[PDB]
Structure 1
């Protein structure tokens, strides 16, 4: 018995390719489109809620996830792989940072920790790479707002705006035309909805679209009052109603 697979399942081919990473990226290509846009006073991340069945409750399945009060994440590719990564990402934010420094990690460093986990699945014994690409949006005091992409290899890049998955090629071209360095948050949400309509085929409403922002602090969502320095989470998930309001003036 016991895990006898102590050797790498991802190896270099004669051409220099790492096959399993390439194939993992192919799995990401098949996945549903998700995107992220950075504004001057915020960041928006969005994706389509592909329902497996109309009997299924798509509210219970959350593609956009809170990692810290000021950091959120969305993906394209294999959902189960994403779910466990979110669990591990949330935990590492505490064990390797908050329990040491008494504060939440900045976006770039949490991203770095997630990337480390995905890199190890590329080299460690008896495992395949993660079949997902992440988009991580977040805010911290000294770096301000930021948006990052994380690939199956463990590589990560900062973006002004980008898209991943099914119709990423067309979506990135659309974003290049619309993006400027003077965009307000509401303008970025508007562009996000426009960009996403191109890739979505069926219904396009607040129930089939999942969208969250990293913006101003939300004292109402904090849960308590009395500490002036604690002003609430910058991560907010837009409601089904809030999305439909913006779809009328589209």
Structure 2
């Protein structure tokens, strides 16, 4: 009685592929257009906000989560897989670093920690592997601003701009052409709305874009108005009005 399932559910096929990773990727291709840009004077990430219903809050909805204070992530794939994964990433990041080295994990180090979760899950049976791909966009004061891709298997590679979801390749073409480093964060926000207007047609607004930047400070993001002791967050998610203001700014 009870489970006995310990046989791996991810297995090799005659070609050298892994059935479960192939499947999972189809889901990711069909998922919501997300991109990431390093502006060099920041990092701007944008993703599609969506609504389920007009009578539905989209405050609760999670399309951009802060993994650690200076770092945000966005994705294309399977929403439920994303939500749990964010949780295990937040937990280990807090317990194992935030009073051990006395600060957040470096971006590359955090990409490896995610990578490991996904790989445990691919090796081991009882459970199928995560079906997701992430774009982890970040700042760490020992590597600047970074952009990574995290694949479903947990393969990762460095990027300085990319897009995943539906309609990626052409989105990368517009981004490649418009930005080539040394660019204001504001300007990268403008370029990003332009790339996505061409990418999404039928109805387009800044109330269907959810935009976050890592690329600012306020005293409010030290979390106190007194005498500094540390630097604190640089994650800031914008409200819908601010985004419409940048849509009005040519």
Superposition TM-score, scaled by structure 1 size:
0.94
Alignment match, 1:107: 107
**1:78, 1:201 → 2: CA distance?**
23
Asked if the contact 1:89/1:114 (under 8 Å) is kept, the reply is yes
**1:193, 1:43 → 2: CA distance?**
15
| 2:98 alignment partner, SS class | helix
1:227, distance to aligned residue in structure 2 (A): 4.6
**Unmatched 5+ stretches in structure 1:** none
- Tell which deviates more after alignment, 222-231 or 63-72: 222-231
Residues 219 and 231 of structure 1: CA distance in aligned 2, closer, same or farther (over 3 Å) = farther
**Unmatched 5+ stretches in structure 2:** none
- Tell which deviates more after alignment, 228-237 or 76-85: 228-237
- Tell which deviates more after alignment, 10-19 or 202-211: 202-211
Alignment match, 2:43: 43
Residues 99 and 5 of structure 1: CA distance in aligned 2, closer, same or farther (over 3 Å) = farther
1:78, distance to aligned residue in structure 2 (A): 0.9
Residues 95 and 2 of structure 1: CA distance in aligned 2, closer, same or farther (over 3 Å) = farther
1:216, distance to aligned residue in structure 2 (A): 2.6
| 1:97 alignment partner, SS class | coil
**1:236, 1:3 → 2: CA distance?**
45
Asked if the contact 1:33/1:168 (under 8 Å) is kept, the reply is yes
Superposition TM-score, scaled by structure 2 size:
0.94
Asked if the contact 1:10/1:122 (under 8 Å) is kept, the reply is yes
- Tell which deviates more after alignment, 45-54 or 207-216: 45-54
**1:43, 1:127 → 2: CA distance?**
35
**1:230, 1:107 → 2: CA distance?**
19
What is the root-mean-square deviation in Å for CA atoms of aligned residues? 1.5
